[PDB]
Amino acid sequence: SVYHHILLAVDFSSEDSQVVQKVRNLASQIGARLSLIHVLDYGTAIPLDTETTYDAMLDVEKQKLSQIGNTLGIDPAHRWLVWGEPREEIIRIAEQENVDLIVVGSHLGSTANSVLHYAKCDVLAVRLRD
Amino acid sequence: SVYHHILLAVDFSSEDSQVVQKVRNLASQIGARLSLIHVLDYGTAIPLDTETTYDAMLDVEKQKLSQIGNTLGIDPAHRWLVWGEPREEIIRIAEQENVDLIVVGSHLGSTANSVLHYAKCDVLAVRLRD
Ligand SMILES: Nc1ncnc2c1ncn2[C@@H]1O[C@H](COP(=O)(O)O)[C@@H](O)[C@H]1O
Ligand SMILES: Nc1ncnc2c1ncn2[C@@H]1O[C@H](COP(=O)(O)O)[C@@H](O)[C@H]1O
């Protein structure tokens, strides 16, 4: 196996579908473990007169992550929902998890180009229908 | 096969060796045809009092291209030695030849980042020992 651990980064756009079945086949053909990441991305002040729905908001993010994770057969131990700047957190989890190929979509300043610039491992940029 | 035609771009540096055996294995594992490209890169005035060795110069470039092409079993019909700007010519041959994955090394303004920005196909950036 040329690569043993692929991290797929998904932004939950319409575009993801292309990369999902492609990455599923790639991982199989080269014999790599898949992990999955989605980054959650008076501005520090919290509204006092309205009810918050942060738990419903997060659950929606979890369900989209799980739709894809289930399709790819990725154990929930290797699915990542993190908050932060996409480029930073994608590279952080890649390094933390011993990933050797990061897969990102590409249509700035873009996420693909930023991950390329800082990645300590190989990067696959799947050209998306922008 | 997720990809049917991989174009490997080589700059003839010490760094190429990493990408060559990696790309050889990748192409085999995913079942893709390999092509290979190296770009040749009073400034328009030609010296009159010295003998030129442009043919020896080109032959050296051909031998380095052929060392790699022979290793990868690439038919000389699919090896490319072109003059121009690397990013432009790499994308030009990719498009001309119906390539679906371009492989480049990555350590600006870099070639990897430029090919990413203009590529109409997927791009693999192999992280080099800079
Ligand atoms: N919040 C995010 N979580 C995970 N991946 C992302 C995120 N935003 C962007 N990406 C990656 O970057 C690609 C294109 O994003 P962008 O350049 O931000 O439009 C997406 O297909 C993902 O691969
Ligand atoms: N003259 C060239 N011909 C083919 N590929 C090149 C050339 N220059 C740069 N590259 C590609 O870009 C990578 C890094 O180049 P650079 O960013 O120019 O240092 C190399 O490993 C090649 O993949």
Residue numbers in the entry:
A (entry chain A), B (entry chain A): 2 to 42, 51 to 116, 125 to 147
From the paper:
The best-studied USP protein MJ0577-ATP from M. janashii contains a typical ATP-binding motif, which is composed of the following residues: G127-SH-G130-(9X)-G140S141V142 (where the superscripts indicate the position of each residue in the sequence). Our structure of NE1028–AMP confirms that the protein can bind at least one molecule of ATP analog per monomer. In the NE1028–AMP structure, a conserved stretch of nonpolar residues (as visible on summarizing multiple sequence alignment—Fig. 8), followed by D14 and also strongly conserved S/T residues and V42, form contacts with the adenine ring. The first three residues from the conserved motif (G116-SH-) contacts ribose and the T130 residue binds the phosphates. All of the residues binding dAMP in AF0826 are analogs of the residues binding AMP in the NE1028 structure, and interact with the ligand in very similar ways, as shown in Fig. 4B and D. Where hydroxyl groups are interacting with G and A (AF0826: G103, A9; NE1028: G114, A10) and adenine ring is positioned by either V or S (S40 and V40, respectively).
Under stress, USPs are overproduced and through a variety of mechanisms aid the organism in surviving in such uncomfortable conditions. Here, we present the structures of both apo- and cofactor-bound forms of an euryarchaeal USP AF0826 from A. fulgidus and a bacterial USP NE1028 from N. europaea.
